[PDB]
Design a protein around this ligand. Structure first.
Ligand SMILES: [K+]
Ligand SMILES: [K+]
Ligand SMILES: [K+]
Ligand SMILES: [K+]
Ligand SMILES: [K+]
Ligand SMILES: [K+]
Ligand SMILES: [K+]
Ligand SMILES: [K+]
Ligand SMILES: [Mg+2]
Ligand SMILES: [Mg+2]
Ligand SMILES: [Mg+2]
Ligand SMILES: [Mg+2]
Ligand SMILES: [Mg+2]
Ligand SMILES: [Mg+2]
Ligand SMILES: [Mg+2]
Ligand SMILES: [Mg+2]
Ligand SMILES: [Mg+2]
Ligand SMILES: [Mg+2]
Ligand SMILES: [Mg+2]
Ligand SMILES: [Mg+2]
Ligand SMILES: [Mg+2]
Ligand SMILES: [Mg+2]
Ligand SMILES: [Mg+2]
Ligand SMILES: [Mg+2]
Ligand SMILES: [Mg+2]
Ligand SMILES: [Mg+2]
Ligand SMILES: [Mg+2]
Ligand SMILES: [Mg+2]
Lengths: 207, 49, 46, 163, 278, 160
RNA sequence: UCAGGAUAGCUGGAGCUCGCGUGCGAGUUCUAUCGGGUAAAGCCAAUGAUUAGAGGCCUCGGGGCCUCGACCUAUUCUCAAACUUUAAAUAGGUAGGACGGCGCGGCUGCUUUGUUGAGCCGCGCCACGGAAUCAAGAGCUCCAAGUGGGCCA
RNA sequence: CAAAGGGUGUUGGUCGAUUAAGACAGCAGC
RNA sequence: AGCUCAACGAGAACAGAAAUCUCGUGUGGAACAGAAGGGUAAAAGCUCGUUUGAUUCUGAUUUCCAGUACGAAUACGAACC
RNA sequence: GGAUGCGAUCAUACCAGCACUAACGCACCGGAUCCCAUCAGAACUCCGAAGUUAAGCGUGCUUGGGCGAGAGUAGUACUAGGAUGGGUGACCCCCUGGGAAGUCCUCGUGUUGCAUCCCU
């Protein structure tokens, strides 16, 4: 059946995505990229830990789903069904070809994989500070599902936002944070003045 | 390219040596043959000998 | 089938040869109306 | 011919610039071209007549003929071990007056007067330009010194904006 | 339901503005390009345009040549200065256009110091005219630039063209659009064309109202009546005007842009007022 | 705001009769407009062939005519008189226009009445030179059209 | 036509025309100027692909006033050899005088409303060589061999 | 030619915790 | 020469998701015989008017390239339209 | 200081909303005999001068969108040359050089030629 992952581990060809030129591509194995309590507010899960790739390699869609399932199961048991939010940060958009002599050897589409780079985040989990140990352990199990070498890095940012935890509290105390579900919006000093609210108008940018 | 520049510097044989005035035109030529040459600032003794 | 290997080396053995440039260039292919008048101007030049 | 059409591989070269399509400004049609002037060939994608082959795009040549709507341009072309003088006619929409010799005329006049001012006083000089030479010695007044040291490594900072 | 905004950020990012004169609706650049583009083997040979423009109450005529810095005016003539020559009313009719074109032709020839060699048409009979070349000098040549108006038969612009031709200027043209030309007969009726040159059509309408609608005549021609001009006296007036033309042809009220300091100060006041609300 | 140049007026009246098929019916329908309006109507052609409606592309399926001036007012009151000087609140478009339809009126044909209201100065958007946009404050709004209909014909607007 | 041949390139021989550093030449740089759409980047820009919530919830459908999905607004994860606003490094073209410049005259059937232009011609005057480095020199012609299976980094 | 993954083999380093107010092991009755 | 397209919004007897008509917005999201790319908005698109430069005579140039031919294209000259 | 005619540069000039303008203009505007024009004097064309600055045109404003410039992103990404450099490999450090682009932040919102006329 499917070839061993070593055959297409190295990035050797240009990107070959599904398009009007490449037809008959099988669907990716992974279809769900967010698991757990994905509706929790930005203020609920301050902690964030990433599983970061340390190699330049192809990661099959089959391995991505396996890592998500393995990480999801342990975190659910260890911490609970409503104590974490796991997000897969990589999407397989590259199509792999297979040549089933060498005359006309251009292969047919076999499957899909993701072209990962060095330092690129593979998986992200946000939860409360009390479940930091469980989150790191869950990512450790998922590491065995990937072909290359990964690394566990604890983020200094508030959940999935782009603000540092110190900055998030600094802005929130100043009333410059407008929750947007999992995201956080920072209020500046631009736009129509009438659009702002009495307590949400500022003269200087948030610096 | 290196072959042409070394010819313009009159360095056609290993361990041959020449003087060269310093200006942006000559320095940029020298930069393009860096691994094939070594150079520096000669003192009065060296020039005399 | 094809390759440009060694072709630049061959070209530089005796090249690159720039064409000889003369003070006066050929008038072939220039506007005949301009050329015809110029011929008459030289004819009556004194 | 022989596997490639006249405009093959001109998707980017012959396309107009972003937000610079439509009517051609009329300063293009008010330019004056004389024999001996230098012009840069830049194909305008909207004008399909008198347009040069893709090779001559981005090349500078010398004007050798002038017609009602086009200028004859001489362009060098390297073929194997020779340089050929290719004479082509191009509509003026595809040519821009080149500033490759803009300094020559003004430089000659300055050289002529400098030599004239030196001839009257019997002082032989040279008007040649020279490349940037070495700087002379000088003193720099002391000021506060900011110390630079290597920074301790932090893995969290190995990403744009950090992890 | 809610409709998607048509003019989003993406719409403005990719929007290319047309030329300022085009989006102001005043210049047809297709026509302008073909009017000023000179043969390159003629080098710096100006191509003069006979620009004729009609406003709601005035006629503007100019001799124009193009340059990189902009258009250069060689000579100009306004219908509003015809009262200096005698014409007081109807400064936008066919006859006035003929007078304006005649005035420009004599002025430009005066400036070029060649008005003596070319006196123009001495017998204005409504027939097509073209000044014959002189002995030691060709007539001044210009091209008609009608602008954005419709080039219909009997248009005022061609009345000014006739005046310029009768003034001694060489202007390429045909008779297919002069007043009096017939689509079916494909001939120019000199009598009808001469009628329009001297305002005969205006005089005919004045007499028609008097016999039928005297009340309408008083209002429709109030300025004509105010200056004692009758329908039968218009032809003599224009003939007199034509002869006269050949004889001799800061406080600020708009606001000023606020300075940066003034604009910032007002912004602070609005910001504080909004914050103090609620 | 009370300037005489802000007075609303009927720009034109358009009578559309979409018979939906060519032949004798369209010819008879056109004659109705010509006598009712006093000018030759225009024959509209189908943009796309539709088998459900039974119309082929580039086939004359409708006829309309544009009327301006006194006859527009004379022919507009007759339509409103048949309508009993009552219109629905939704019959007025946001761009200061309204219309109605009669089904009694060769034969009997149903007509489509649409009225365009404009203030003086709309030429700026219709002229060829210096074509511009009418100022927002000077445009006829939905509210303005309703008030004009309630004072010109003292009609009633039924929200329903 | 594909184990071949001719053709051009590469090569030899024969010279010839000049030149001796004042060279007008260069698989180099410098100065000035011109062209580009790869690398990267971009989607929080068009086109295409694609994850998630948030608000509004007007209007449409879905089911059971509720309700899910469509919708609209502001955000968000991740992408493109045959996508792209932007955009390198390297490489590509042109120019840096005696074939220059100025002054006064002349020629024309071309050109101009116009001895107005355009090009050319004659005379006079000026022109320290008009970036660096190198230059076992530069140009021109004739006759002809071999070769037209390549391979390696 | 060698991999993922492992070692209370040994040698450096990084972060944290405990300790003369008595830790740790054992012993003794927290 | 005049005109502006795709689409959407708001309106009108039969008439509806979709016939025709009206206003508004509309950078081309249409159209331009065919593949794809490029190009085009008072146009190169759409609708009308007049028409046959889809004409006659050479030579030159570009692309191909041996700097041969053919095909195709471009800039002029001399005629007739 | 401006307007108008013809323009050059083609958004710092565009788009949206709000506000304002002396004089001369430019407009809207009145009419349909004649030329011309359509289903339609709406447009186009012709003739005219009662009315109005309501609109257009012009100017100003907006913690407006866009556009333009700077800063920053960042000596980061990438890249020319070098090594009997590291590493199982993937890849990467160092040496001689070159060197970007979104987000975020600040600022700006046209300039100008010829002619005529008003302010005079
Ligand atoms: K692993
Ligand atoms: K191909
Ligand atoms: K980018
Ligand atoms: K996108
Ligand atoms: K051979
Ligand atoms: K160890
Ligand atoms: K046209
Ligand atoms: K429309
Ligand atoms: Mg096996
Ligand atoms: Mg491959
Ligand atoms: Mg062949
Ligand atoms: Mg080939
Ligand atoms: Mg063609
Ligand atoms: Mg035209
Ligand atoms: Mg053999
Ligand atoms: Mg041979
Ligand atoms: Mg460059
Ligand atoms: Mg390419
Ligand atoms: Mg590309
Ligand atoms: Mg890339
Ligand atoms: Mg063989
Ligand atoms: Mg072979
Ligand atoms: Mg190991
Ligand atoms: Mg196409
Ligand atoms: Mg052809
Ligand atoms: Mg009217
Ligand atoms: Mg106003
Ligand atoms: Mg802004």
């Amino acid at each position: 059946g499917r070839r061993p992952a070593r055959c297409y581990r190295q990035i050797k060809n240009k990107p070959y995505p599904k398009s009007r030129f490449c037809r008959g591509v099988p669907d990716p194995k992974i279809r769900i990229y967010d698991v757990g309590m994905k509706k929790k507010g930005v203020d609920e899960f301050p902690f964030c830990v990433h599983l970061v790739s340390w190699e330049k390699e192809n990661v099959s869609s089959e391995a991505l789903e396996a890592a998500r399932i393995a990480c999801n199961k342990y975190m659910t048991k260890s911490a609970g069904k409503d104590a974490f939010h796991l997000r897969v940060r990589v999407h397989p958009f590259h199509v792999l070809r297979i040549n089933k002599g060498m005359r006309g050897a251009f292969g047919k589409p076999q499957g899909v994989c993701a072209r990962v780079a060095i330092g690129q985040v593979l998986l992200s989990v946000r939860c409360k500070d009390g479940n930091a140990n469980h989150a790191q352990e869950a990512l450790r199990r998922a590491k065995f599902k990937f072909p290359g070498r990964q690394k566990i890095i604890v983020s200094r940012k508030w959940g999935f936002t782009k603000f540092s935890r110190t900055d998030y509290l600094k802005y929130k105390s100043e009333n410059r944070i407008v929750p947007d579900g999992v995201n956080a919006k920072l209020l500046g000093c631009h736009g129509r003045l009438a659009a702002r609210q009495p307590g949400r108008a500022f003269l200087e940018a948030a610096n | 390219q290196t072959k042409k520049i070394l010819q313009l510097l009159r360095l056609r044989q290993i361990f041959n040596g020449v003087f060269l005035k310093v200006n942006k035109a000559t320095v940029n030529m020298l930069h393009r043959v860096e691994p094939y040459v070594t150079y520096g600032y000669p003192n009065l003794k060296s020039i005399k000998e | 089938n094809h390759t440009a290997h060694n072709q630049s080396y061959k070209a530089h053995r005796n090249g690159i040869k720039k064409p000889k440039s003369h003070r006066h260039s050929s008038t072939k292919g220039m506007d005949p109306k301009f050329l015809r008048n110029q011929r008459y101007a030289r004819k009556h030049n004194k | 011919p022989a596997g490639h059409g006249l405009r093959s591989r001109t998707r980017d070269s012959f396309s107009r610039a972003f937000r610079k399509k439509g009517t051609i400004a009329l300063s293009t049609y008010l330019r004056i071209f004389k024999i001996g002037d230098y012009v840069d060939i830049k194909v305008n994608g909207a004008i399909h007549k008198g347009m040069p082959h893709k090779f001559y795009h981005g090349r500078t040549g010398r004007v050798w003929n002038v017609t009602k709507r086009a200028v004859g341009v001489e362009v060098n072309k390297q073929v194997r071990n020779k340089i050929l003088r290719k004479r082509i006619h191009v509509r003026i929409e595809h040519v821009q007056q080149s500033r490759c010799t803009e300094e020559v005329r003004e430089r000659i006049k300055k050289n002529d007067q400098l030599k004239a001012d030196a001839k009257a006083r019997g002082e032989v000089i040279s008007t040649k330009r020279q490349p940037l030479g070495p700087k002379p010695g000088f003193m720099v007044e002391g000021a506060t010194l900011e110390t630079v040291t290597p920074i301790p490594y932090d893995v969290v900072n190995d990403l744009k904006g950090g992890y | 339901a809610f409709i998607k905004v048509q003019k989003t950020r993406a719409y403005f990012k990719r929007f290319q503005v047309k030329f300022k004169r085009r989006r102001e609706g005043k210049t047809d650049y297709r026509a302008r390009n073909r009017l000023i583009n000179q043969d390159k083997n003629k080098y710096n040979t100006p191509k003069y345009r006979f620009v004729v423009r009609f406003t709601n109450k005035d006629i503007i005529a100019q001799i124009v040549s193009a340059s990189i810095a902009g258009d250069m005016i060689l000579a100009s003539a306004y219908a509003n200065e015809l009262p200096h020559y005698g014409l007081e009313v109807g400064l936008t009719n066919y006859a006035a256009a003929y007078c304006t074109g005649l005035l420009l032709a004599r002025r430009v020839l005066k400036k070029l110091e060649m008005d003596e060699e070319y006196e123009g048409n001495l017998e204005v009979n409504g027939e097509d005219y073209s000044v014959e070349p002189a002995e030691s000098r060709r007539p001044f040549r210009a091209l008609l630039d009608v602008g954005l108006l419709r080039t219909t038969t009997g248009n005022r612009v061609f009345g000014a063209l006739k005046g310029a031709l009768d003034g001694g200027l060489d202007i390429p043209h045909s008779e297919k659009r002069f007043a009096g030309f017939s689509k079916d007969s494909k001939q120019l009726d000199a009598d009808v064309h001469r009628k329009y040159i001297y305002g005969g059509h205006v005089a005919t309408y004045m007499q028609t109202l008097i016999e039928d609608e005297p009340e309408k005549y008083q209002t429709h021609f109030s300025q004509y009546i105010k200056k004692g001009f009758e329908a039968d006296g218009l032809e003599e007036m224009y003939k007199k005007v034509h002869a006269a033309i050949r004889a001799d042809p800061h406080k600020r009220y708009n606001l000023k842009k606020l300075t940066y300091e003034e604009r910032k100060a007002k912004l602070i006041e609005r910001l504080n007022a909004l914050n103090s609300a609620a | 705001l009370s300037n005489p140049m802000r007075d609303i007026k009927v720009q034109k009246l358009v009578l559309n009769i979409s018979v939906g098929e060519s032949g004798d019916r369209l010819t008879r329908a056109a004659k109705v407009l010509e006598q009712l309006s006093g000018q030759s109507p225009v024959f509209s052609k189908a943009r796309y062939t539709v088998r459900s409606f039974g119309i082929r592309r580039n086939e004359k399926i409708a006829c309309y005519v544009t009327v301006r001036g006194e006859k527009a007012m004379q022919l507009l009151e007759s339509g409103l008189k048949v309508k009993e000087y009552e219109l629905l609140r939704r019959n007025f478009s946001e761009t200061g226009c309204f219309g109605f339809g009669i089904q009694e009126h060769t034969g009997i044909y149903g007509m489509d009445f649409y009225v365009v209201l404009e203030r003086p100065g709309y030429r700026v958007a219709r002229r060829r030179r210096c074509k511009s946009r009418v100022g927002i404050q000077h445009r006829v709004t939905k509210e303005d059209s309703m008030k004009w209909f309630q004072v010109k014909y003292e009609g009633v607007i039924l929200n329903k």
